[PDB]
Amino acid sequence: KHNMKAFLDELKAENIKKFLYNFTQIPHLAGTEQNFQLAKQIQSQWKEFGLDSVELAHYDVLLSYPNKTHPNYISIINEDGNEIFNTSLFEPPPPGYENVSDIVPPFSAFSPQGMPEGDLVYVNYARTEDFFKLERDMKINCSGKIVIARYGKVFRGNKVKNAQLAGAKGVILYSDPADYFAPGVKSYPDGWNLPGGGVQRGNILNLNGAGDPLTPGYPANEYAYRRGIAEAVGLPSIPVHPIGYYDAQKLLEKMGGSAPPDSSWRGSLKVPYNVGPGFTGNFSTQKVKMHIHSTNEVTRIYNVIGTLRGAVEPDRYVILGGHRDSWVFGGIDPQSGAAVVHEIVRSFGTLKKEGWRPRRTILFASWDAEEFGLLGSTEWAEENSRLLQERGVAYINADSSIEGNYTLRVDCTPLMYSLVHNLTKELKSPDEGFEGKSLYESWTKKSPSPEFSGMPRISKLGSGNDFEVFFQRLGIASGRARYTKNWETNKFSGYPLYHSVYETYELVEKFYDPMFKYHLTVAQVRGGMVFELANSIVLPFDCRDYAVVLRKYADKIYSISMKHPQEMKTYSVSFDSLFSAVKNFTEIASKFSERLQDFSNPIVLRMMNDQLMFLERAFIDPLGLPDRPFYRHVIYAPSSHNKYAGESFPGIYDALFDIESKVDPSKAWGEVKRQIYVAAFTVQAAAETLSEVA
Amino acid sequence: KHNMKAFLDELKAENIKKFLYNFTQIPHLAGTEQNFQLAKQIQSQWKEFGLDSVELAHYDVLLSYPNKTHPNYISIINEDGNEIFNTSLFEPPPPGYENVSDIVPPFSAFSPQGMPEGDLVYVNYARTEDFFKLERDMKINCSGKIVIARYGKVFRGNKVKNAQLAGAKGVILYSDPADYFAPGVKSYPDGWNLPGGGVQRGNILNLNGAGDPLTPGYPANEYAYRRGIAEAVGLPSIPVHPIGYYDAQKLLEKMGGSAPPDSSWRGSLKVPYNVGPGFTGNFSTQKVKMHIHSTNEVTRIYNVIGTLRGAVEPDRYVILGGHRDSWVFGGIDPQSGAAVVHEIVRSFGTLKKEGWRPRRTILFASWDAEEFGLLGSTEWAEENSRLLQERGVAYINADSSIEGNYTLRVDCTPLMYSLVHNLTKELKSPDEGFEGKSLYESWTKKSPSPEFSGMPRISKLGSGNDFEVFFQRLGIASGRARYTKNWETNKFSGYPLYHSVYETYELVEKFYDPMFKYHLTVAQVRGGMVFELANSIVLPFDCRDYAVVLRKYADKIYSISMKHPQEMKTYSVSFDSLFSAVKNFTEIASKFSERLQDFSNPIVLRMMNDQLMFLERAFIDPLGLPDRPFYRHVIYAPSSHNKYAGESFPGIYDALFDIESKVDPSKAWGEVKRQIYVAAFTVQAAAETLSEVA
Ligand SMILES: *[C@@H]1O[C@H](CO)[C@@H](O[C@@H]2O[C@H](CO)[C@@H](O[C@@H]3O[C@H](CO)[C@@H](O)[C@H](O[C@H]4O[C@H](CO)[C@@H](O)[C@H](O)[C@@H]4O)[C@@H]3O)[C@H](O)[C@H]2NC(C)=O)[C@H](O)[C@H]1NC(C)=O
Ligand SMILES: *[C@@H]1O[C@H](CO)[C@@H](O[C@@H]2O[C@H](CO)[C@@H](O[C@@H]3O[C@H](CO)[C@@H](O)[C@H](O[C@H]4O[C@H](CO)[C@@H](O)[C@H](O)[C@@H]4O)[C@@H]3O)[C@H](O)[C@H]2NC(C)=O)[C@H](O)[C@H]1NC(C)=O
Ligand SMILES: O=C(O)CC[C@H](NC(=O)NC[C@@H](NC(=O)CCCNC(=O)c1ccc(I)cc1)C(=O)O)C(=O)O
Ligand SMILES: O=C(O)CC[C@H](NC(=O)NC[C@@H](NC(=O)CCCNC(=O)c1ccc(I)cc1)C(=O)O)C(=O)O
Ligand SMILES: *[C@@H]1O[C@H](CO)[C@@H](O[C@@H]2O[C@H](CO)[C@@H](O)[C@H](O)[C@H]2NC(C)=O)[C@H](O)[C@H]1NC(C)=O
Ligand SMILES: *[C@@H]1O[C@H](CO)[C@@H](O[C@@H]2O[C@H](CO)[C@@H](O)[C@H](O)[C@H]2NC(C)=O)[C@H](O)[C@H]1NC(C)=O
């Protein structure tokens, strides 16, 4: 039989291992020839594997690279302007790769050029709350200072935006061992920890969903009109550069001024973590100087797009997409994920060769330039937005399959909760101690839902990956799943060797997943989800799961507001309309579900599959959220303080945030009320898409 | 048989006459009790007629009314400030209605209050070109002047916007006999001409598609957050009032300053048509004073929404909509149209009672507050936007069935051209001299296409009626048809008694359509279109007709640009991408049409009906046109100089308009190129929705 079990059984751990090895021998930086070569290789193999068509879709987008003949570095400069200390020009290459060419040195992509010199202020993680503490409580002024921040907690672009708005003239990012060195494990190559010479690459844009900075709204095709650099979206205005903890220790050890305000500001290095500004008495005349010479350059990128045409509903698309570009070798990020997609295609192709086709069309994507701001996926979605919004059933992302070896991590629309629970109950746990048990059982045990006994935790979708355009811009139901660590406090920080030259095939094979069983389990989860979404006669979405979370989010936003009872009285701020809409959504969703259970009529079925498919779409507001036009979903947006995290009722949340500091409370509470009305209306409108149609 | 002929034969001239009489005995001004009563009557009768459900949908929107105890009027005021001449407080009521209560006096809806006093400047029709001529050629400065403009040529809101931007401190609108009195016909009640005491009411907003000025984007429901008046959309900033030609003659007769620049500035009254400013020597110290006391007030309005559920595709909606509110008795505008809708419902209901249902759902709408800015239709569409955009097949408007008795007038999407030609070939001409001939034959003869021998003229959709939200905001294929006059130069001016108390049942019965045969022919056209759209197995749209017009519009915009060859060289302005996209659209549309002809498979059919339905939708850009976010269609928008007229490739058109006057040509031509790229991309994207889906 050609059924999900046939699909799942064809997947092999050994194939995923071979593909990962194949994809990680040389760097595949976006815009480079080696990444174009790998695109062509994947295109060829997907054809060989049996897909109906496999094309490259190319765009010319703004990328950023260091100047090969004029290296980026930071100095401590004395009174005379002698540079007495210089940060490294490169990470020490790992064993056996000390000769591999074209390893991009650590840099912050899209930094402007400059050579600012000044006094350091240490700003902890450079979060909103850290800047509040400095400016409001400690009365330290970052204006004209170079700020030094530890990586972790939040997306680095938010750190840079926050430092910019505090008036910094430059930013130094570093990896603290507190955040990137797990106690009791060895540094690479002897373990999975970050060495003191290791450095995390990464872009520092604030795109808010725009895609290529030069062509917001429209694909960066051959005839595209581009903005000038001065009008580009999301570029930082101050130089930024990342360093490792050996170099950071040299910059931090001499810091003076104020003590750290408390222990949450102290990392693990042997330094006081003084906030500054400047150095202690003896060194008070020394300064820090950055030298940044990177250039932004419009560069061609290539997505690979594979199609497996549906037998019955070829005009309904289920999309499995993940990126191919890497900072260096991409051992975890993204080739762990791409090897799994490759094996999924291979398995589907095997069934296809035996005469099977999925009911709906499956699209497979190898995205380019994800590392430079989700550019490949977003440009292709801009090009194809009309097809995706009227035909897009679901999007499953497929970046790194693993970031740990403890248990499963799933973020998805509530519409897929039931699908995920049911599938995981049917898969074998790969975990030690759970042999013979389901993945559901091991996952539920290791990661319990905070809300419900006997269920696992599933999180809201945030951002920082290629599902952003499909979910928050276009409103297509989206999901993602990977194996993760047990390190609750490091949730948004990344695994130690994130975006470092040390992220290699050997890292994975030796220390993460020697038997490739966690990769195989993730291939079963991602592939199984795609199989059910593409083959189930009724789409496997349960609208009642949305009703449950809408009530939780309404309770949560109401609680936030109720910290300000006097203002809610003065300004007549009521959540009644939002609770009413949620109540209605609950009631209508319950009725729709009964009808879905209670209908040989393919029109009624497709009418009802259309209602299911367009239900995520109904949460889109075509006017977007305030000052963020490409975040259109009214229930979920990436947090304005941390792009990785999702926020619920983001429009109301942002209207309430720090409201006690607004100078015009009447205006500020008016805007709260406006956002309550938008959210209540959108909930009611989405509910009504599930009413009888006539 | 239950077929289109059964539908059409059930329609009766005599019924339309009875309904028109019934709808025109008392005023039905939006927001008034009598218009709520008529809403309830229509609701009851539509239920009686057999529709499955008939509801009222109410909203609370900004309307505008004169102050009953403080009348609006204009004076000539002498040196001392004695008012030596005052305009009328009301139009002389017509015979037999001199006792009818609650006739709203002439006023300009949404005028602010004020009592400005100053010197007159006469600005012809107050068009863009008229202001250019005054300021640029004649060097007359309107700043701080009261401008007096004749009605005609363009929407009155554009006149007021233009006078405002010229710095006028007030506007007087009047009906010139040149434009509102046809030679050789008698004034009402002895003929269809405007008497010198007659005055045209009408709103002077510039909403650009927004709907209720206080709630752009969102329905004006019970919990809606409203903007403050200062932030409302589209309100004029200077007082405005309309008068008749007896009063205008008194204001114009004393004008001095410059002669009219040419004969196109002279109307038919016995006055010089001096542009001013001010009065000739003897009267140079007299001034004009307006007194406006109207108030804007949030007021409840009621749409009636009738549903006839589809037998096969109940989730596909074909909408017949027209308004019910009138300025006074609404003899032509809108009850001529509403009586026809009423008879169409009655006929469909007759078939329904015999067991028939249409294949798709038909929605019938009686809109409120159209006269105050398309408020009823636009609020309901805002409420229901998700349903309409995923299920809306087509919208047929149904305002006035007649504005003349000469021949048919049709504006529609190119997707309905073939449908209109085919239907009119099947209907009887009602015209004298064409007995036994088709409507197609008489219409083609009296109104030949400028492009093609043997075809009739069909125009682009403009605006100024309730299709605006459905076509230019939401991208639903739209059409409209009425009987019209032979008066080419009066195309956008209106029939003489437009929006006057003299627009009565008697006007129509005596002078327009005594046998109600033109009404019946229009009921057959509108009803026939709805029947085919709702019942045809394959949607009756021909995508190739769009390809033909896209090429015409591309040629036209290219020609406009080519008036500036040096700039196109300097700035590298190329239309190549737009012509390429049009060529592609032509080729793909040709292939789609062959597939549509060449397929028992209901999925392929519905897939292909979805492609047809979503093809108009593909021309929508979710970012809207510059500074006009609710005009989203890239091929058609209402002209920025005249809301009644449609403009093609409006984004490029507006970028090219008056470009030789821009101070920064590089920036201005950059914006031309940007609009060419948006249009080329949108055309290509729409084409690709017609490609094979996988
Ligand atoms: C959740 O679903 C329910 C439907 O089950 C829906 O109920 C609707 O609520 C509105 C209130 O927001 C009702 O609106 C009323 O309609 C009547 C006419 O039917 C009007 O007369 C009412 O207006 C008067 O009273 C108001 C309040 O005191 C005054 O402000 C106003 O000036 C008038 O005096 C009012 O407009 C509507 O009838 C029901 N519909 C039903 C029960 O079918 C509810 O709105 C949904 N929630 C959301 C958030 O959409
Ligand atoms: C109308 O439909 C046709 C398809 O029948 C479609 O043709 C496409 O046109 C683009 C040009 O805009 C082609 O893009 C080229 O793609 C190749 C790879 O296939 C690239 O190497 C080319 O880039 C080089 O050359 C450029 C021009 O000299 C340089 O600017 C660039 O730096 C590179 O050197 C170029 O990107 C594309 O291949 C075809 N696709 C086909 C034929 O299938 C056309 O675009 C459609 N019209 C619109 C408006 O969409
Ligand atoms: O430009 C952009 O918007 C992002 C570009 C780029 N993307 C990535 O590197 N994403 C990979 C991964 N990120 C990390 O592992 C860093 C920690 C944050 N991630 C999660 O917490 C996390 C991880 C998995 C899951 I399931 C949930 C949260 C990730 O977030 O996927 C970058 O961040 O530099
Ligand atoms: O606020 C708004 O946007 C409009 C509100 C209001 N609407 C109307 O009165 N519309 C009725 C009718 N208008 C007229 O007859 C005036 C002349 C312009 N119409 C057409 O040229 C015309 C007529 C029929 C056809 I077919 C094509 C063009 C009309 O345009 O339908 C108004 O104009 O004051
Ligand atoms: C990764 O695997 C691919 C596919 O097996 C290898 O590319 C093939 O290499 C052989 C020998 O050079 C060629 O004859 C084929 O034409 C290639 N197939 C393609 C590109 O589809 C590639 O060499 C492997 N890379 C590494 C680093 O092992
Ligand atoms: C997940 O599995 C549950 C349990 O099988 C499914 O719920 C059942 O669905 C069937 C088929 O429609 C109903 O007859 C049962 O009453 C349901 N059992 C329940 C709710 O306890 C559920 O539909 C599955 N979720 C999917 C497919 O998304």
Ligand SMILES: *[C@@H]1O[C@H](CO)[C@@H](O[C@@H]2O[C@H](CO)[C@@H](O)[C@H](O)[C@H]2NC(C)=O)[C@H](O)[C@H]1NC(C)=O
């Ligand atoms: C317009 O027609 C309607 C419907 O025939 C008339 O309203 C009816 O009037 C009779 C007598 O007053 C009532 O018994 C019915 O209840 C009404 N039917 C409704 C409202 O559905 C109305 O009188 C007519 N108006 C004019 C001006 O002739």
Ligand SMILES: *[C@@H]1O[C@H](CO)[C@@H](O[C@@H]2O[C@H](CO)[C@@H](O)[C@H](O)[C@H]2NC(C)=O)[C@H](O)[C@H]1NC(C)=O
């Ligand atoms: C309008 O009528 C024409 C002539 O009947 C229709 O075109 C024909 O459609 C049939 C049925 O698909 C084809 O087999 C013929 O070849 C067509 N004749 C032509 C193009 O000359 C046309 O489809 C009708 N338009 C509609 C229904 O929108």
Ligand SMILES: *[C@@H]1O[C@H](CO)[C@@H](O)[C@H](O)[C@H]1NC(C)=O
């Ligand atoms: C890189 O730096 C060198 C000098 O070290 C300079 O000549 C060259 O222009 C730079 N390349 C760029 C800006 O791409």
Ligand SMILES: *[C@@H]1O[C@H](CO)[C@@H](O)[C@H](O)[C@H]1NC(C)=O
């Ligand atoms: C740091 O680099 C600069 C530039 O090459 C050089 O002048 C200086 O000697 C270096 N300082 C140290 C301590 O190596």
Ligand SMILES: *[C@@H]1O[C@H](CO)[C@@H](O)[C@H](O)[C@H]1NC(C)=O
């Ligand atoms: C921070 O410093 C700069 C002056 O160097 C000043 O413009 C700004 O107002 C200061 N902010 C404070 C003290 O709050």
Ligand SMILES: *[C@@H]1O[C@H](CO)[C@@H](O)[C@H](O)[C@H]1NC(C)=O
């Ligand atoms: C793999 O699992 C073991 C067992 O808990 C753990 O100690 C080890 O650190 C894990 N590897 C990684 C990279 O987490």
Ligand SMILES: *[C@@H]1O[C@H](CO)[C@@H](O)[C@H](O)[C@H]1NC(C)=O
């Ligand atoms: C109308 O005018 C009268 C005085 O003539 C005034 O008292 C009343 O307030 C006005 N009504 C309004 C502004 O609605």
Ligand SMILES: *[C@@H]1O[C@H](CO)[C@@H](O)[C@H](O)[C@H]1NC(C)=O
């Ligand atoms: C015009 O009306 C005003 C206000 O009622 C009045 O004072 C004046 O006498 C009137 N003038 C004429 C000529 O009727």
Ligand SMILES: *[C@@H]1O[C@H](CO)[C@@H](O)[C@H](O)[C@H]1NC(C)=O
């Ligand atoms: C028109 O008149 C006003 C002064 O009353 C002035 O501000 C404006 O510049 C003038 N425009 C001209 C003369 O172009």
Ligand SMILES: *[C@@H]1O[C@H](CO)[C@@H](O)[C@H](O)[C@H]1NC(C)=O
């Ligand atoms: C009705 O038709 C006749 C015949 O051409 C024409 O003379 C008359 O003016 C028409 N009525 C109207 C209102 O146009």
Ligand SMILES: [Ca+2]
């Ligand atoms: Ca873009």
Ligand SMILES: [Ca+2]
């Ligand atoms: Ca509104």
Ligand SMILES: [Cl-]
């Ligand atoms: Cl992922």
Ligand SMILES: [Cl-]
């Ligand atoms: Cl109309």
Ligand SMILES: [Zn+2]
């Ligand atoms: Zn990644």
Ligand SMILES: [Zn+2]
């Ligand atoms: Zn990454």
